[model samples]
Target: GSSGSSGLPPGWEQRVDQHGRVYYVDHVEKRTTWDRPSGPSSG
Candidate 1:
């Protein structure tokens, strides 16, 4: 279904800003970013 298809992390999600571009939100950390979250990039 459309559940996990979101592909977002437990605390992360996708949204649209005033500019109409896709944005990211980390609920756990209460932060936002322009990068796509596909797991950490470092150790």
Candidate 2:
């Protein structure tokens, strides 16, 4: 299974974007976003 981080409250759901990227969905907050990319220094 895929995994991601959203740092959101409980009751959140998981979904995949058209790009096949992982993200979290907060129905209560109506928010959706992907895990932040690593710092530039890591590149």
Candidate 3:
């Protein structure tokens, strides 16, 4: 039930780092920005 519809699918989208814990971006793994989960976590 997912295939990228401006809501994450064909790859993914929804990352927040710099203190904010939020991961989800596999755009073919061409990661140019998206990966945060080291310390302090929050919205």
Query: Could you tell me how far off, in angstroms, the CA of residue 24 lies in candidate 2 after the best superposition?
Result: 0.7
| Candidate 2, residue 43: lDDT | 22
Candidate 1's TM-score reads 0.55
Where in model 2 is the C-alpha error above 4 Å? 1-9, 36-43
Q: Tell me each candidate's TM-score.
A: 0.55, 0.52, 0.26
Cα lDDT tens digits for candidate 3, 1-43: 7776544556667867787776676667756344432356456
Candidate structures ordered by TM-score, highest first: 1, 2, 3
Question: Relative to the unseen true structure, what is the C-alpha lDDT of residue 33 in candidate 3, on a scale of 0 to 100?
Answer: 40
Better of 1 and 2 by TM-score: 1
Clashing pairs in 3: 4-9
How many pairs collide in each candidate, listed in order? 0, 0, 1
What is the C-alpha lDDT profile of model 2 across 1-43, one tens digit per residue? 4577535457677888999998877777777667532234332
Among these predictions, the greatest lDDT belongs to 1
Q: Which tens-of-lDDT digit does each residue in 1-43 have in candidate 1? A: 5565645667788888898788789988888776676556554
